[PDB]
Amino acid sequence: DFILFCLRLMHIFTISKTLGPKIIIVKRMMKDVFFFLFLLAVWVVSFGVAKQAILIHNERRVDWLFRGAVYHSYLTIFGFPEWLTVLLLCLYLLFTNILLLNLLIAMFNYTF
Amino acid sequence: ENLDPSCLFHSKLQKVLVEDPERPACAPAAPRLQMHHVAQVLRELLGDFTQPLYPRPRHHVTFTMDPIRDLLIWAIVQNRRELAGIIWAQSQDCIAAALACSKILKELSKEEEDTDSSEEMLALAEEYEHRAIGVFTECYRKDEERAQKLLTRVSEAWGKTTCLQLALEAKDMKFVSHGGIQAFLTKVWWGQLSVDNGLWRVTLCMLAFPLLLTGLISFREKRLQDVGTPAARARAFFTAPVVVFHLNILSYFAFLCLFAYVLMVDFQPVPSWCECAIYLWLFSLVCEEMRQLFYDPDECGLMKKAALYFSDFWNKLDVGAILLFVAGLTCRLIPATLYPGRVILSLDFILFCLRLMHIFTISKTLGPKIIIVKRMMKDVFFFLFLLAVWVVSFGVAKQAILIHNERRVDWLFRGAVYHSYLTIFGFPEWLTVLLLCLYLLFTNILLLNLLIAMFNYTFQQVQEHTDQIWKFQRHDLIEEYHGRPAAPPPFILLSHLQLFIKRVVLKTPAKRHKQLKNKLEKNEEAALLSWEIYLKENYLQNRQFQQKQRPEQKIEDISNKVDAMVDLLDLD
C-alpha cells in the first residue's frame, strides 16, 4: 500500500504544460508492453529449460539446482566444450541482443 | 474468328487449335475453330478451380446464357479498353465480373514478353478492381446483411465459383482490405454467438461449465438466446471456432509443460508412461496434419496441393519438428545413444516452443510487428557476420601481442575466448589505456549506429503496408479452424476415426460448408441480382457527376466554348 500511495505522486506532473502529454503517451504504450513481455518470458524460459536439460543430469534437488539455474537465467536476462559453449553463447547473442530489441524499437516508435 | 492477330491470346489460341488431336483425326490442313477451345484456354487463364464455361457437345438462332459475359471476355482478352468500359455497364452480375476481368488481365499481363501492353493491362486490371470496390461499397452502405449475402453465393455465369475465392486468387489487396468483408471475416470467426462479448467472458465460460447456462456472455439469432435449450446452446458454444482455438492453445500449453517435465526429470532408459502419453499426443498431432494435407474440397492436383501445403511457413516448421522427433525416438531406443537422443529432444523442445509465436498473429495490433520482424532478420544475419569477424580480429590481435607462443590446448584458448566474450557482452598504463580506448571508440559507437541506421531504414518501409498484407493474410487462419473438428488433440483421434471409416466405404470425399459457399434458390437470386443491378445504376451516375465536377474538365469546357465563340464571330 506504500507502493500504491507513492504511485499517486505521478499525478502532479499532469498540471505542467510540457509533461502531461508524455503521461498520456505512456498510458497508451503499456497495452502492447504487456503482450510483449509475455513473449519475452516464454522465450527465456525456453532457453533456460533447454540449457538445464542438456548440461545437467536428472536430479531431484528441490531448491539448490533449481535456484542455481534460475539465477543463471536471471543473469543472462539482465544483461571439448569450446565449440559447444561458443555455439550456445553466440546463439543467445544472436537471438537476445538483436531480434526482440528491434521488435520493441519498432512497436514503440510506431505507437509513439 | 476475326480476333486480331498481334495479341497474345490469338497466339495461345492458335497453339491450342493444333494441339487438339481431333483435328488431325478429321483433317490436318483444315483448322476448325470451336467454342470449347476458347473455354479451355480460358480455363488455363482463370484457374483450375473453376469449371469450363462453354461446354463440349457430346452428340434457328440460339442464345447461350448471359451473352454480355461472352462479349465482355472477348473485349477484355485483346485489351480493347473503351469497348469493355461500355459493355460492362450492361452486365448482369457486375461484382463477380469485375474481379474475373482483373484476374484474367493480371494473368495475361504476366506472360506478355513486351513492355507497353503489359503496363496497359496492369492499369486496366487495377481500374476494374476499383469498379468492384465501388459497386460493393454502394451495396454495403444501403443494406448491411444482403451485402454479406452477396459474397458467399455461387455464380453460375463464371463457372460455379464464389466472389471471395476469385478476389483471393486474383490477389486483390484493396478489395479484401475493405471494411465490410473484414466484418464478414470477424462474423464467421465469432461463429454462432454475438461478436460483442469480449475475450475474458469467453475465457470464463471456457473455464466454467455452468456459467454458460446463466445470463452471462451473449448470443445472436435470439430464438436460441431467449428460449433455454442448454444442450443446443452448449453445442453452439463448442462449435464456434474461437472456442476451438482457445481449446487447442490450452491443450498445447499442457502438452508443452508435460514435455518439459519429462525431459527435465523422467528421461529413463526403461520405457516410461509419461513419455508414452506424449508419444500418443504427438501421433495425434501428426495424424491431424496428415488429415489437413489430404483435404481436397474441389478436385485438384495432388502435387499442386502438396506445393500449396509446403508453401506455408508453419507447415514447414510443424513437419520439421515431427521429423526431428521421429529421429529423436530412434536415438532414444538405442542405449548407447541415449544422451544424444536427450539433446535432440531438447532442440525439438525449442522448435515446439517457437510454434507458440503463431498465437499473436490473430490479434489486431500484434501481427504487423511479426511481419516486420520477418523482414528484419535478413540483414540481421549479414550484420552479425561483420560483427563476428571484427571481434575475432581484436581477440587474435590482443592474444598475439600480450601472450607468447604457447601450445596450451584448452587453458589459454578458453581464457582468451572468455576474455573476448566478456568484452563482447558489455609501463603498460599508456598501452592499456590505448587498447581500452580503441575498443571503446570502435565497439561503443560505430556498429551500433550501423544497426540503428539499417533497422530504422527497413522499419520505415515495411511499416507502411504490413497492415494491408495482414488483412489479406487473415483469411486462411479462419478457413482452417472452420474446417478443423472441435476436439482438442487428445480426443481428435475419436473425431478422426469416424470420419476415416466413413470416407472409405460410402460417403462424399470432401464438401464445402454452407457458411463460406452456398447455392441460393432461384426465387431469392432473382431479387438479389435485380437489387444489385439497381445499385450499379445508382453508382454510375455519382461516378460521372464526380468526374464532371473536376476543375480541369471545367477549364476544357470553357476552352471549347471560347473556340466556338471565336468561330461564330469569324463567321459573321
Add this chain to the structure above:
Amino acid sequence: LKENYLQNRQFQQKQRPEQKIEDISNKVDAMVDLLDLD
C-alpha cells in the same frame, strides 16, 4: 525513335493546365479586339 519521342514531349507540354489558361487568355484578347473593331 527520337522522332517518336519529340511528339510525345510536345503533346505532354501542350496538355499542361497553365498553358491552357494562357491559350484561353489569348483567345479572349483576340475576341475583345474583334469586338472593338466592329
Add this chain to the structure above:
Amino acid sequence: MLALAEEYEHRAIGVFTECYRKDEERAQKLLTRVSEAWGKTTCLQLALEAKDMKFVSHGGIQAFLTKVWWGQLSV
C-alpha cells in the same frame, strides 16, 4: 549553364528510355559502341566522366552492368 546541362541529360534519358522500351537488346548494343563523330569514345565513358547520376541510375544500364557482371552464364 548548369540548368542547360541538366536539361540535356534529361533529353538523353528520354531518348534512351524510348529506345529501351521498344527493344531490349539493341538498346544495350547502343551503349558500348564507339562513336566516330565525337572522337572515338563510347557513350558510357562520357556519361561517367561527365558525372551524370540520373543517366547511370536508369534501370536498363544497371541491367547492362548486371549482365556484364554475371558474364557468360545466365543471370
